[PDB]
Design a protein around this ligand. Structure first.
Ligand SMILES: CCCN1CC[C@@H](CCc2ccc([C@@H]3c4ccc(O)cc4CC4(CC4)N3C(=O)c3ccccc3)cc2)C1
Ligand SMILES: CCCN1CC[C@@H](CCc2ccc([C@@H]3c4ccc(O)cc4CC4(CC4)N3C(=O)c3ccccc3)cc2)C1
Lengths: 223, 234
């Protein structure tokens, strides 16, 4: 039934599903120093809203809960990262983790990933990434990050998102050549977001459990 | 940059490296990694020659060429392996005389996880019926794209050039698919499917990089620079 939405209906649904921007849980009256504790706590709170968002991506909830959890397990860090890059676009050289937690690169192994995220924000700024495009990209990360590491339904939803992205670019006046060129440009940034998630995962080990994710998904009560 | 799509395909097909063999030290679990390392080392030399023939690559500085190869070489080995393996379900065709199944990939801690990811990519290629012309385009995208987000006025010019070459490879992939008779819808859908596989190949390369370091092991910047930094005396 979700595969029957029009491109405009798909965009509207994704825009409406957007999660809120959360704040860091630091007392702004106290001394600043604890950064990883604040960032970890923010990420933990941002996961619940991510799950609520995922449940509104058309087609996601037609999957079994087991497969929903596996997609979230694969995608959650990439999704946190692309959200961070999106909100940092208009803050050259800085990362807007929260509206009260804007850090620059001067604030072991952290700067390497900080620089990669700053480079993604700058690429988004160079391409003039639109909000409608960003929500489609985030939905593609959710469905594609865990699809090879477990499928037909996932691929049909991914195809619908590609159609929606192309529709947005055609509506913006791009030529057919510019549409395919921009689609490729946006999807190649996803490979860099995967790379960052991989390197970020290494840095953090230097993971939300299946049960935690399943609990956040709040299963229906008639099994 | 002025090549047509047809000329791009032709240049990429002509640049393709040869399929190398393993030595004919009999094969055993104990000798496996030595055999695979020796093969990869020989493939890397041909990979350098191939890269210099990818349109637009040698227009970049030496330093940037090295950086792009440093970031891409394992992905390139892997996608080559997945392509060689596409017609052999359940097996990885490292060489025509070195065709392994995943039970052979269990002797080393952490190998079977990567082996399975590679088999899954091979299966995906097969389900998509990936064409040879599409493959060489994807391999060229990996070369130009994997390191472009990890690099001055010269750097800005290099990045603009890389993105222009990437755009012409996109145009080439679309041309191939149009020529194959796909609708415009099917063309953008297949372009997206192909490019999303590159995210999985990046993931496999990062996991592979961790596995290689767990064992002992990469081409140094200086080694890659030595092979790329050729003289003109031959
Ligand atoms: C209860 C189960 C355990 N939990 C479950 C979930 C797990 C959470 C681990 C965790 C801890 C911290 C981050 C932040 C963070 C926070 C919010 C954001 O939106 C984005 C980010 C981006 C990010 C990922 C790179 N990050 C860093 O700090 C960082 C930024 C630049 C350079 C180096 C590091 C994300 C994720 C811990
Ligand atoms: C001083 C210079 C040092 N050299 C520089 C170059 C470096 C070479 C390290 C090196 C050693 C071995 C591989 C093989 C290999 C060989 C050929 C192929 O086409 C592809 C592959 C694929 C690959 C990377 C995953 N692999 C494995 O074994 C493997 C396969 C499945 C699961 C787990 C592991 C590649 C690369 C060492």
């Amino acid at each position: 039934l979700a595969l029957s939405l029009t491109a405009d209906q798909m965009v509207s649904a994704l825009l409406d599903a957007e999660p809120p921007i959360l704040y860091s849980e630091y007392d702004p009256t106290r001394p600043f120093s604890s950064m990883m504790g604040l960032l970890t706590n923010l990420a933990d709170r941002e996961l619940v809203h991510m799950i609520n968002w995922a449940k509104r991506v058309p087609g996601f909830v037609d999957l079994t809960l087991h497969d929903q959890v596996h997609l979230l397990e694969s995608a959650w860090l990439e999704i946190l990262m692309i959200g961070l890059v999106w909100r940092s676009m208009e803050h050259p050289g800085k990362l807007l983790f929260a509206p009260n937690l804007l850090l620059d690169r001067n604030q072991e192994g952290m700067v390497e990933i900080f620089d990669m995220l700053l480079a993604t924000s700058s690429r988004f700024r160079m391409m003039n990434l639109q909000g409608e495009e960003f929500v489609c990209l985030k939905s593609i990360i959710l469905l594609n990050s865990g699809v090879y590491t477990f499928k037909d339904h996932i691929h049909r939803v991914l195809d619908k998102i590609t159609d929606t992205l192309i529709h947005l670019m055609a509506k913006a006046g791009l030529t057919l050549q510019q549409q395919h060129q921009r689609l490729a440009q946006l999807l190649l940034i996803l490979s860099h977001i995967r790379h960052m998630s991989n390197k970020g995962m290494e840095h953090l080990y230097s993971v939300p459990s299946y049960d935690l994710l399943l609990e956040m998904l709040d299963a229906h009560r008639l099994h």
